[PDB]
Amino acid sequence: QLTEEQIAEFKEAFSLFDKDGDGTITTKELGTVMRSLGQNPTEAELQDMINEVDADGDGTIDFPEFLTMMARKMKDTDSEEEIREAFRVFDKDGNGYISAAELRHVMTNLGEKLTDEEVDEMIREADIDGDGQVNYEEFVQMMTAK
Ligand SMILES: [Ca+2]
Ligand SMILES: [Ca+2]
Ligand SMILES: [Ca+2]
Ligand SMILES: [Tb+3]
């Protein structure tokens, strides 16, 4: 039973993925989005990637499947591999560290203007140690913090 408060937040993600507002996420748009994220996925990956979110193999993604894909993860096993790439995917420094600055560097290219007072707070609001920066160890805390 997904609460509305959750179903809403998800909507925000879509508008971020489907810039065309067609109502379906395609590979051409997916790669383009990940291509600007500093990532360089292969053709076999992007195409095969959609499959993961495409259980019906229709060639596109909808709301029911868009949430299921994310929700499912919460209702199944997880691979620290995804937490590594995504995380290291932001630390272009390959150092594995995301400072309130670096985060603002990438999250900024997203195409949305964010405020420092917010980012600084978020990162500092999640940093169980409050070091103004997030470490790989902290990343687990969130998933290990009931
Ligand atoms: Ca589209
Ligand atoms: Ca770094
Ligand atoms: Ca720290
Ligand atoms: Tb589908």
Short mmCIF file of N, CA, C and O and ligand atoms in Angstrom, two decimals:
data_model
loop_
_atom_site.label_atom_id
_atom_site.label_comp_id
_atom_site.label_asym_id
_atom_site.label_seq_id
_atom_site.Cartn_x
_atom_site.Cartn_y
_atom_site.Cartn_z
N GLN A 1 0.83 -1.20 0.00
CA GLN A 1 0.00 0.00 0.00
C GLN A 1 0.87 1.25 0.00
O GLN A 1 1.29 1.73 1.05
N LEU A 2 1.14 1.78 -1.19
CA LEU A 2 1.96 2.98 -1.32
C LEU A 2 1.16 4.22 -0.93
O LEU A 2 0.07 4.46 -1.46
N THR A 3 1.71 5.01 -0.01
CA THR A 3 1.04 6.23 0.43
C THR A 3 1.13 7.31 -0.63
O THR A 3 2.11 7.38 -1.38
N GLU A 4 0.11 8.17 -0.69
CA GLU A 4 0.09 9.25 -1.67
C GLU A 4 1.38 10.07 -1.59
O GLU A 4 1.97 10.42 -2.61
N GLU A 5 1.81 10.37 -0.37
CA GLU A 5 3.02 11.15 -0.17
C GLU A 5 4.18 10.55 -0.95
O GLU A 5 5.11 11.25 -1.34
N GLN A 6 4.12 9.24 -1.18
CA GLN A 6 5.17 8.55 -1.92
C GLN A 6 4.88 8.59 -3.42
O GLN A 6 5.78 8.85 -4.23
N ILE A 7 3.63 8.34 -3.79
CA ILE A 7 3.24 8.35 -5.19
C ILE A 7 3.52 9.71 -5.82
O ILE A 7 3.80 9.81 -7.01
N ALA A 8 3.44 10.76 -5.00
CA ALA A 8 3.69 12.11 -5.49
C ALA A 8 5.17 12.30 -5.81
O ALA A 8 5.54 12.61 -6.94
N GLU A 9 6.01 12.12 -4.80
CA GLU A 9 7.45 12.28 -4.98
C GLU A 9 7.90 11.60 -6.26
O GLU A 9 8.74 12.14 -6.99
N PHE A 10 7.35 10.42 -6.54
CA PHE A 10 7.71 9.68 -7.74
C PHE A 10 7.44 10.52 -8.99
O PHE A 10 8.25 10.55 -9.91
N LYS A 11 6.30 11.20 -9.00
CA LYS A 11 5.93 12.04 -10.14
C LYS A 11 7.07 13.01 -10.48
O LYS A 11 7.36 13.24 -11.65
N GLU A 12 7.70 13.56 -9.45
CA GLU A 12 8.80 14.49 -9.65
C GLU A 12 9.93 13.83 -10.44
O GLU A 12 10.54 14.45 -11.30
N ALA A 13 10.19 12.57 -10.13
CA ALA A 13 11.25 11.83 -10.81
C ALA A 13 10.95 11.72 -12.30
O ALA A 13 11.82 11.93 -13.14
N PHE A 14 9.70 11.38 -12.62
CA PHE A 14 9.30 11.24 -14.02
C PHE A 14 9.61 12.51 -14.80
O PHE A 14 10.38 12.48 -15.76
N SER A 15 9.02 13.62 -14.37
CA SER A 15 9.25 14.90 -15.04
C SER A 15 10.74 15.12 -15.28
O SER A 15 11.13 15.90 -16.15
N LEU A 16 11.57 14.43 -14.50
CA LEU A 16 13.01 14.56 -14.63
C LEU A 16 13.54 13.59 -15.69
O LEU A 16 14.55 13.86 -16.34
N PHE A 17 12.85 12.47 -15.86
CA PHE A 17 13.26 11.48 -16.85
C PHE A 17 12.61 11.76 -18.20
O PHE A 17 13.28 11.81 -19.22
N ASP A 18 11.29 11.94 -18.18
CA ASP A 18 10.55 12.22 -19.41
C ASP A 18 10.44 13.72 -19.64
O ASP A 18 9.46 14.35 -19.24
N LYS A 19 11.45 14.29 -20.29
CA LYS A 19 11.46 15.72 -20.57
C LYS A 19 10.49 16.05 -21.70
O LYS A 19 10.08 17.20 -21.86
N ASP A 20 10.14 15.04 -22.49
CA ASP A 20 9.22 15.25 -23.61
C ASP A 20 7.77 15.23 -23.13
O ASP A 20 6.87 15.66 -23.84
N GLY A 21 7.56 14.74 -21.91
CA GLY A 21 6.22 14.67 -21.35
C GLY A 21 5.30 13.82 -22.22
O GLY A 21 4.12 14.14 -22.39
N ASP A 22 5.85 12.75 -22.78
CA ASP A 22 5.06 11.86 -23.63
C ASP A 22 4.25 10.88 -22.79
O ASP A 22 3.19 10.41 -23.22
N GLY A 23 4.74 10.58 -21.60
CA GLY A 23 4.05 9.66 -20.71
C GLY A 23 4.76 8.31 -20.67
O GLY A 23 4.28 7.36 -20.04
N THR A 24 5.89 8.21 -21.35
CA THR A 24 6.65 6.97 -21.39
C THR A 24 8.14 7.26 -21.52
O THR A 24 8.55 8.14 -22.28
N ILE A 25 8.95 6.51 -20.77
CA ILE A 25 10.40 6.69 -20.81
C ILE A 25 11.03 5.78 -21.86
O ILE A 25 10.87 4.56 -21.80
N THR A 26 11.74 6.38 -22.81
CA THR A 26 12.38 5.61 -23.86
C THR A 26 13.89 5.54 -23.63
O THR A 26 14.42 6.20 -22.73
N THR A 27 14.57 4.74 -24.44
CA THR A 27 16.02 4.59 -24.31
C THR A 27 16.73 5.83 -24.83
O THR A 27 17.74 6.26 -24.27
N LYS A 28 16.20 6.41 -25.90
CA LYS A 28 16.80 7.60 -26.49
C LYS A 28 16.86 8.73 -25.46
O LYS A 28 17.80 9.53 -25.46
N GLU A 29 15.86 8.79 -24.60
CA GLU A 29 15.81 9.82 -23.57
C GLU A 29 16.61 9.39 -22.34
O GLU A 29 17.23 10.22 -21.67
N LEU A 30 16.58 8.10 -22.05
CA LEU A 30 17.31 7.57 -20.90
C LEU A 30 18.81 7.80 -21.06
O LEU A 30 19.45 8.41 -20.19
N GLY A 31 19.36 7.31 -22.16
CA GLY A 31 20.79 7.47 -22.42
C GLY A 31 21.18 8.95 -22.42
O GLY A 31 22.16 9.34 -21.77
N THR A 32 20.42 9.76 -23.14
CA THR A 32 20.70 11.19 -23.21
C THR A 32 20.81 11.79 -21.82
O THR A 32 21.65 12.65 -21.56
N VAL A 33 19.96 11.32 -20.91
CA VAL A 33 19.97 11.81 -19.54
C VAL A 33 21.21 11.31 -18.80
O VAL A 33 21.85 12.06 -18.06
N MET A 34 21.54 10.04 -19.00
CA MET A 34 22.71 9.45 -18.35
C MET A 34 23.99 9.88 -19.05
O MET A 34 25.06 9.89 -18.45
N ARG A 35 23.87 10.24 -20.32
CA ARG A 35 25.03 10.67 -21.10
C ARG A 35 25.58 11.99 -20.56
O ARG A 35 26.78 12.23 -20.59
N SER A 36 24.68 12.84 -20.06
CA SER A 36 25.09 14.13 -19.52
C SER A 36 25.51 13.99 -18.06
O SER A 36 26.11 14.90 -17.49
N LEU A 37 25.21 12.84 -17.47
CA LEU A 37 25.56 12.59 -16.08
C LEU A 37 27.03 12.18 -15.97
O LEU A 37 27.51 11.84 -14.88
N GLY A 38 27.74 12.23 -17.09
CA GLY A 38 29.15 11.86 -17.10
C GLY A 38 29.32 10.36 -17.30
O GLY A 38 30.43 9.83 -17.17
N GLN A 39 28.23 9.68 -17.61
CA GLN A 39 28.27 8.24 -17.83
C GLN A 39 28.26 7.91 -19.32
O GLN A 39 27.65 8.62 -20.11
N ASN A 40 28.95 6.83 -19.68
CA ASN A 40 29.02 6.42 -21.08
C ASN A 40 28.60 4.96 -21.23
O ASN A 40 29.44 4.07 -21.33
N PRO A 41 27.31 4.71 -21.24
CA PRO A 41 26.76 3.33 -21.37
C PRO A 41 26.80 2.84 -22.82
O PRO A 41 26.64 3.62 -23.76
N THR A 42 26.99 1.53 -22.98
CA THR A 42 27.04 0.94 -24.31
C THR A 42 25.63 0.75 -24.87
O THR A 42 24.65 0.89 -24.14
N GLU A 43 25.54 0.44 -26.16
CA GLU A 43 24.25 0.24 -26.79
C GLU A 43 23.55 -0.99 -26.22
O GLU A 43 22.33 -1.00 -26.05
N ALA A 44 24.33 -2.02 -25.92
CA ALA A 44 23.78 -3.25 -25.37
C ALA A 44 23.30 -3.02 -23.93
O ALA A 44 22.43 -3.74 -23.44
N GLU A 45 23.88 -2.03 -23.27
CA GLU A 45 23.50 -1.72 -21.90
C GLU A 45 22.21 -0.91 -21.87
O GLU A 45 21.22 -1.32 -21.26
N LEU A 46 22.22 0.25 -22.53
CA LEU A 46 21.04 1.10 -22.57
C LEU A 46 19.81 0.30 -22.98
O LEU A 46 18.80 0.29 -22.28
N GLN A 47 19.91 -0.37 -24.13
CA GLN A 47 18.79 -1.18 -24.62
C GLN A 47 18.41 -2.25 -23.61
O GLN A 47 17.25 -2.39 -23.25
N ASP A 48 19.41 -3.00 -23.14
CA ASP A 48 19.16 -4.06 -22.17
C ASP A 48 18.73 -3.46 -20.83
O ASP A 48 18.05 -4.12 -20.04
N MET A 49 19.12 -2.21 -20.59
CA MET A 49 18.77 -1.54 -19.35
C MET A 49 17.26 -1.36 -19.25
O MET A 49 16.65 -1.71 -18.23
N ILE A 50 16.66 -0.82 -20.30
CA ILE A 50 15.22 -0.61 -20.32
C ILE A 50 14.48 -1.89 -19.97
O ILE A 50 13.45 -1.87 -19.29
N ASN A 51 15.01 -3.02 -20.43
CA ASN A 51 14.40 -4.31 -20.16
C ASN A 51 14.15 -4.48 -18.66
O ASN A 51 13.07 -4.92 -18.25
N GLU A 52 15.14 -4.13 -17.86
CA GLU A 52 15.02 -4.24 -16.41
C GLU A 52 13.74 -3.57 -15.93
O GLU A 52 13.00 -4.13 -15.12
N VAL A 53 13.48 -2.37 -16.44
CA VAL A 53 12.28 -1.63 -16.05
C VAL A 53 11.11 -2.01 -16.94
O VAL A 53 9.96 -1.66 -16.66
N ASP A 54 11.40 -2.73 -18.02
CA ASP A 54 10.35 -3.16 -18.95
C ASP A 54 10.09 -4.66 -18.81
O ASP A 54 10.73 -5.47 -19.48
N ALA A 55 9.15 -5.01 -17.94
CA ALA A 55 8.82 -6.42 -17.73
C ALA A 55 7.89 -6.92 -18.83
O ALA A 55 7.93 -8.09 -19.21
N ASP A 56 7.04 -6.03 -19.33
CA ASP A 56 6.10 -6.39 -20.39
C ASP A 56 6.79 -6.39 -21.74
O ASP A 56 6.23 -6.83 -22.74
N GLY A 57 8.02 -5.88 -21.77
CA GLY A 57 8.79 -5.82 -23.01
C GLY A 57 8.01 -5.07 -24.09
O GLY A 57 8.04 -5.45 -25.27
N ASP A 58 7.32 -4.01 -23.69
CA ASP A 58 6.54 -3.22 -24.63
C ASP A 58 7.45 -2.26 -25.40
O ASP A 58 7.11 -1.82 -26.50
N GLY A 59 8.60 -1.95 -24.82
CA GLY A 59 9.55 -1.04 -25.45
C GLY A 59 9.54 0.33 -24.77
O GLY A 59 10.30 1.22 -25.14
N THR A 60 8.66 0.48 -23.79
CA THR A 60 8.56 1.75 -23.06
C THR A 60 8.26 1.50 -21.59
O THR A 60 8.05 0.36 -21.17
N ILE A 61 8.25 2.57 -20.80
CA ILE A 61 7.97 2.46 -19.38
C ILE A 61 6.80 3.34 -18.98
O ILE A 61 6.66 4.46 -19.48
N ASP A 62 5.96 2.84 -18.08
CA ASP A 62 4.80 3.60 -17.63
C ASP A 62 4.90 3.87 -16.13
O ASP A 62 5.92 3.59 -15.50
N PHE A 63 3.83 4.42 -15.55
CA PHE A 63 3.82 4.73 -14.13
C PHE A 63 3.85 3.45 -13.29
O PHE A 63 4.70 3.28 -12.43
N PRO A 64 2.93 2.55 -13.53
CA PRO A 64 2.85 1.26 -12.79
C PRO A 64 4.19 0.53 -12.77
O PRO A 64 4.59 -0.04 -11.75
N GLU A 65 4.87 0.54 -13.91
CA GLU A 65 6.16 -0.13 -14.02
C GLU A 65 7.29 0.77 -13.50
O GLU A 65 8.30 0.28 -13.00
N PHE A 66 7.10 2.08 -13.64
CA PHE A 66 8.10 3.03 -13.18
C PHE A 66 8.26 2.96 -11.67
O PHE A 66 9.37 3.10 -11.14
N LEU A 67 7.15 2.74 -10.97
CA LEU A 67 7.19 2.65 -9.51
C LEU A 67 7.58 1.24 -9.08
O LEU A 67 8.40 1.06 -8.18
N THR A 68 6.99 0.24 -9.73
CA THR A 68 7.28 -1.15 -9.41
C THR A 68 8.79 -1.40 -9.43
O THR A 68 9.33 -2.02 -8.52
N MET A 69 9.45 -0.90 -10.47
CA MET A 69 10.89 -1.07 -10.59
C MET A 69 11.60 -0.58 -9.33
O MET A 69 12.47 -1.26 -8.79
N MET A 70 11.21 0.60 -8.86
CA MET A 70 11.82 1.17 -7.66
C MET A 70 11.30 0.46 -6.41
O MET A 70 12.08 0.04 -5.56
N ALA A 71 9.98 0.33 -6.31
CA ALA A 71 9.38 -0.33 -5.16
C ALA A 71 9.91 -1.75 -5.02
O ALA A 71 10.27 -2.18 -3.92
N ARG A 72 9.95 -2.48 -6.13
CA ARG A 72 10.44 -3.85 -6.11
C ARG A 72 11.72 -3.95 -5.29
O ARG A 72 11.83 -4.78 -4.38
N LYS A 73 12.70 -3.11 -5.62
CA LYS A 73 13.97 -3.11 -4.91
C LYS A 73 13.74 -3.18 -3.40
O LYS A 73 14.46 -3.87 -2.69
N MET A 74 12.74 -2.44 -2.93
CA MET A 74 12.43 -2.42 -1.51
C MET A 74 11.80 -3.74 -1.08
O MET A 74 11.77 -4.07 0.11
N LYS A 75 11.28 -4.49 -2.05
CA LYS A 75 10.65 -5.77 -1.76
C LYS A 75 11.47 -6.92 -2.34
O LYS A 75 10.92 -7.88 -2.87
N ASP A 76 12.79 -6.81 -2.23
CA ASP A 76 13.67 -7.85 -2.75
C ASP A 76 15.11 -7.60 -2.30
O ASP A 76 15.38 -6.66 -1.55
N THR A 77 16.02 -8.45 -2.76
CA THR A 77 17.43 -8.32 -2.39
C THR A 77 18.05 -7.12 -3.10
O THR A 77 17.52 -6.62 -4.09
N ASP A 78 19.19 -6.67 -2.58
CA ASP A 78 19.88 -5.53 -3.17
C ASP A 78 21.35 -5.86 -3.42
O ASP A 78 21.94 -6.70 -2.73
N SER A 79 21.94 -5.21 -4.42
CA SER A 79 23.34 -5.44 -4.75
C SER A 79 24.17 -4.19 -4.49
O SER A 79 23.95 -3.15 -5.10
N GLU A 80 25.14 -4.31 -3.58
CA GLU A 80 26.00 -3.18 -3.25
C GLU A 80 26.69 -2.64 -4.50
O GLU A 80 27.30 -1.58 -4.47
N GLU A 81 26.58 -3.39 -5.60
CA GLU A 81 27.19 -2.98 -6.85
C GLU A 81 26.53 -1.71 -7.39
O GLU A 81 27.21 -0.80 -7.86
N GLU A 82 25.21 -1.66 -7.30
CA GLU A 82 24.46 -0.50 -7.78
C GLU A 82 24.76 0.72 -6.91
O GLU A 82 24.80 1.85 -7.40
N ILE A 83 24.96 0.48 -5.61
CA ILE A 83 25.25 1.57 -4.69
C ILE A 83 26.66 2.11 -4.91
O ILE A 83 26.97 3.24 -4.53
N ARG A 84 27.51 1.29 -5.52
CA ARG A 84 28.89 1.69 -5.79
C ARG A 84 28.95 2.59 -7.02
O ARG A 84 29.46 3.71 -6.95
N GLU A 85 28.43 2.10 -8.14
CA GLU A 85 28.43 2.87 -9.37
C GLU A 85 27.74 4.22 -9.17
O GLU A 85 28.36 5.27 -9.33
N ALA A 86 26.46 4.17 -8.81
CA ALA A 86 25.70 5.40 -8.59
C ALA A 86 26.50 6.38 -7.74
O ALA A 86 26.63 7.55 -8.08
N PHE A 87 27.03 5.89 -6.62
CA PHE A 87 27.82 6.73 -5.73
C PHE A 87 29.08 7.23 -6.43
O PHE A 87 29.29 8.43 -6.56
N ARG A 88 29.91 6.29 -6.88
CA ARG A 88 31.14 6.65 -7.56
C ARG A 88 30.84 7.38 -8.87
O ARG A 88 31.71 8.05 -9.43
N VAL A 89 29.61 7.24 -9.35
CA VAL A 89 29.21 7.89 -10.59
C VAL A 89 29.12 9.41 -10.40
O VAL A 89 29.17 10.17 -11.37
N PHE A 90 28.98 9.83 -9.15
CA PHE A 90 28.89 11.26 -8.84
C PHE A 90 30.25 11.82 -8.47
O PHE A 90 30.54 12.99 -8.73
N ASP A 91 31.09 10.99 -7.86
CA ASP A 91 32.42 11.43 -7.45
C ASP A 91 33.40 11.34 -8.62
O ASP A 91 34.30 10.51 -8.63
N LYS A 92 33.20 12.21 -9.61
CA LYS A 92 34.06 12.22 -10.79
C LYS A 92 35.54 12.15 -10.40
O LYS A 92 36.39 11.82 -11.23
N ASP A 93 35.83 12.45 -9.14
CA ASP A 93 37.22 12.42 -8.67
C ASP A 93 37.68 10.98 -8.47
O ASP A 93 38.86 10.72 -8.22
N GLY A 94 36.74 10.04 -8.57
CA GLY A 94 37.06 8.63 -8.40
C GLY A 94 37.62 8.37 -7.01
O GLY A 94 38.11 7.27 -6.72
N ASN A 95 37.55 9.38 -6.14
CA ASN A 95 38.06 9.24 -4.78
C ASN A 95 37.01 8.59 -3.89
O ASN A 95 37.33 8.05 -2.83
N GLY A 96 35.76 8.64 -4.33
CA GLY A 96 34.67 8.04 -3.56
C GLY A 96 34.18 8.99 -2.47
O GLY A 96 33.71 8.56 -1.42
N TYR A 97 34.30 10.29 -2.73
CA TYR A 97 33.86 11.29 -1.76
C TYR A 97 32.98 12.34 -2.42
O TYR A 97 33.30 12.84 -3.50
N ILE A 98 31.87 12.67 -1.77
CA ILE A 98 30.95 13.67 -2.31
C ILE A 98 30.76 14.81 -1.32
O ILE A 98 29.99 14.71 -0.37
N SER A 99 31.47 15.91 -1.56
CA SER A 99 31.37 17.08 -0.68
C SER A 99 30.24 18.00 -1.14
O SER A 99 29.90 18.05 -2.32
N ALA A 100 29.66 18.72 -0.19
CA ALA A 100 28.57 19.64 -0.50
C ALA A 100 28.86 20.42 -1.78
O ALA A 100 27.96 20.94 -2.43
N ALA A 101 30.14 20.48 -2.14
CA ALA A 101 30.55 21.20 -3.35
C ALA A 101 30.38 20.31 -4.58
O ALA A 101 29.64 20.64 -5.50
N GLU A 102 31.09 19.19 -4.59
CA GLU A 102 31.02 18.26 -5.71
C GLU A 102 29.56 17.94 -6.05
O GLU A 102 29.16 18.00 -7.21
N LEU A 103 28.78 17.61 -5.03
CA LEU A 103 27.37 17.29 -5.23
C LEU A 103 26.67 18.41 -5.99
O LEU A 103 25.86 18.15 -6.88
N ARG A 104 26.97 19.65 -5.62
CA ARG A 104 26.36 20.80 -6.27
C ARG A 104 26.90 20.96 -7.68
O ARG A 104 26.29 21.63 -8.52
N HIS A 105 28.05 20.35 -7.95
CA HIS A 105 28.66 20.44 -9.27
C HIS A 105 27.90 19.58 -10.28
O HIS A 105 27.60 20.03 -11.39
N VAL A 106 27.59 18.35 -9.88
CA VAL A 106 26.86 17.44 -10.76
C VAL A 106 25.37 17.73 -10.71
O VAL A 106 24.76 18.06 -11.73
N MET A 107 24.78 17.59 -9.53
CA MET A 107 23.35 17.83 -9.37
C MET A 107 22.94 19.15 -10.02
O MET A 107 21.76 19.39 -10.28
N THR A 108 23.93 20.00 -10.29
CA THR A 108 23.66 21.29 -10.92
C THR A 108 23.48 21.13 -12.43
O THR A 108 22.57 21.71 -13.02
N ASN A 109 24.35 20.34 -13.05
CA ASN A 109 24.28 20.11 -14.48
C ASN A 109 22.95 19.46 -14.86
O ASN A 109 22.56 19.45 -16.03
N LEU A 110 22.26 18.90 -13.87
CA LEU A 110 20.99 18.25 -14.11
C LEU A 110 20.06 19.15 -14.92
O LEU A 110 19.28 18.68 -15.74
N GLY A 111 20.17 20.46 -14.69
CA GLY A 111 19.34 21.42 -15.40
C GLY A 111 18.40 22.14 -14.44
O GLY A 111 17.50 22.87 -14.86
N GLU A 112 18.64 21.95 -13.15
CA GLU A 112 17.82 22.59 -12.12
C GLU A 112 18.70 23.39 -11.17
O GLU A 112 19.69 22.87 -10.65
N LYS A 113 18.35 24.65 -10.95
CA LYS A 113 19.13 25.51 -10.06
C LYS A 113 18.80 25.20 -8.60
O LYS A 113 17.66 25.39 -8.16
N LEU A 114 19.80 24.74 -7.86
CA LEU A 114 19.60 24.41 -6.45
C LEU A 114 20.29 25.44 -5.57
O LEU A 114 21.20 26.15 -6.01
N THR A 115 19.86 25.53 -4.31
CA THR A 115 20.44 26.48 -3.38
C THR A 115 21.48 25.79 -2.50
O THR A 115 21.37 24.61 -2.19
N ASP A 116 22.50 26.55 -2.09
CA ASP A 116 23.56 26.00 -1.25
C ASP A 116 23.03 25.73 0.16
O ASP A 116 23.39 24.73 0.78
N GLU A 117 22.18 26.62 0.65
CA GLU A 117 21.61 26.46 1.98
C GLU A 117 20.88 25.13 2.10
O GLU A 117 20.83 24.53 3.18
N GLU A 118 20.31 24.67 0.99
CA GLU A 118 19.59 23.41 0.98
C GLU A 118 20.56 22.23 0.89
O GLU A 118 20.60 21.38 1.78
N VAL A 119 21.34 22.20 -0.18
CA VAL A 119 22.30 21.12 -0.38
C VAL A 119 23.17 20.95 0.86
O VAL A 119 23.31 19.85 1.39
N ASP A 120 23.76 22.05 1.32
CA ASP A 120 24.62 22.01 2.50
C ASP A 120 23.87 21.41 3.68
O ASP A 120 24.45 20.66 4.47
N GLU A 121 22.59 21.73 3.80
CA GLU A 121 21.77 21.21 4.88
C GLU A 121 21.51 19.72 4.69
O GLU A 121 21.71 18.92 5.60
N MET A 122 21.05 19.35 3.50
CA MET A 122 20.76 17.96 3.19
C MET A 122 21.97 17.08 3.52
O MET A 122 21.88 16.18 4.37
N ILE A 123 23.08 17.34 2.85
CA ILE A 123 24.30 16.56 3.08
C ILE A 123 24.69 16.59 4.55
O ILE A 123 25.10 15.58 5.12
N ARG A 124 24.55 17.76 5.17
CA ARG A 124 24.89 17.91 6.58
C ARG A 124 23.77 17.38 7.46
O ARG A 124 23.98 17.08 8.64
N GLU A 125 22.58 17.25 6.89
CA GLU A 125 21.43 16.75 7.63
C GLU A 125 21.40 15.23 7.61
O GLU A 125 20.75 14.60 8.45
N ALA A 126 22.11 14.64 6.65
CA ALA A 126 22.16 13.19 6.54
C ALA A 126 23.45 12.64 7.14
O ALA A 126 23.48 11.53 7.66
N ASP A 127 24.51 13.44 7.06
CA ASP A 127 25.80 13.03 7.60
C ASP A 127 25.70 12.78 9.10
O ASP A 127 25.81 13.70 9.91
N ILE A 128 25.49 11.52 9.47
CA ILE A 128 25.36 11.15 10.88
C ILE A 128 26.50 11.76 11.69
O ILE A 128 26.38 11.95 12.90
N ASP A 129 27.62 12.05 11.03
CA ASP A 129 28.77 12.63 11.71
C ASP A 129 28.79 14.14 11.53
O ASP A 129 29.46 14.86 12.27
N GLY A 130 28.05 14.63 10.54
CA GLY A 130 27.99 16.06 10.27
C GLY A 130 29.37 16.60 9.90
O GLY A 130 29.87 17.53 10.52
N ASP A 131 29.97 16.00 8.87
CA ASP A 131 31.29 16.43 8.42
C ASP A 131 31.18 17.31 7.18
O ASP A 131 32.18 17.61 6.53
N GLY A 132 29.96 17.71 6.86
CA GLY A 132 29.73 18.56 5.69
C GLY A 132 29.91 17.76 4.40
O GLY A 132 29.69 18.28 3.30
N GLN A 133 30.32 16.50 4.54
CA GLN A 133 30.52 15.64 3.38
C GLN A 133 29.97 14.25 3.65
O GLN A 133 29.80 13.85 4.80
N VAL A 134 29.69 13.51 2.58
CA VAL A 134 29.15 12.16 2.72
C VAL A 134 30.21 11.12 2.34
O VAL A 134 30.88 11.25 1.32
N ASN A 135 30.33 10.09 3.17
CA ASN A 135 31.30 9.03 2.91
C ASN A 135 30.58 7.74 2.53
O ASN A 135 29.40 7.58 2.83
N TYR A 136 31.29 6.84 1.87
CA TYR A 136 30.69 5.57 1.46
C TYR A 136 30.08 4.86 2.66
O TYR A 136 29.09 4.14 2.54
N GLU A 137 30.69 5.06 3.83
CA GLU A 137 30.20 4.43 5.05
C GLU A 137 28.82 4.98 5.42
O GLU A 137 27.93 4.23 5.81
N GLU A 138 28.66 6.29 5.29
CA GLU A 138 27.39 6.93 5.61
C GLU A 138 26.30 6.43 4.68
O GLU A 138 25.16 6.22 5.10
N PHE A 139 26.65 6.25 3.41
CA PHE A 139 25.69 5.77 2.42
C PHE A 139 24.97 4.53 2.94
O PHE A 139 23.77 4.35 2.72
N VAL A 140 25.71 3.66 3.63
CA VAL A 140 25.14 2.44 4.17
C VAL A 140 24.26 2.76 5.38
O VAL A 140 23.22 2.13 5.58
N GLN A 141 24.69 3.73 6.18
CA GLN A 141 23.93 4.12 7.36
C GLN A 141 22.46 4.32 7.02
O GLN A 141 21.58 3.71 7.63
N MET A 142 22.20 5.17 6.03
CA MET A 142 20.83 5.45 5.61
C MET A 142 20.07 4.14 5.39
O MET A 142 18.94 3.99 5.85
N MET A 143 20.70 3.21 4.68
CA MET A 143 20.08 1.92 4.41
C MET A 143 20.15 1.02 5.64
O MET A 143 19.49 -0.02 5.70
N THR A 144 20.96 1.43 6.61
CA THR A 144 21.11 0.65 7.84
C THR A 144 20.53 1.41 9.03
O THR A 144 20.63 0.96 10.17
N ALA A 145 19.92 2.55 8.75
CA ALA A 145 19.33 3.37 9.81
C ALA A 145 17.80 3.27 9.77
O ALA A 145 17.16 3.86 8.90
N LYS A 146 17.24 2.51 10.70
CA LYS A 146 15.79 2.35 10.76
C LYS A 146 15.11 3.68 11.06
O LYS A 146 14.13 3.99 10.40
CA CA B 1 10.30 10.77 -24.09
CA CA B 2 36.49 13.60 -3.96
CA CA B 3 32.21 12.32 6.89
TB TB B 4 6.49 -1.29 -19.93
#
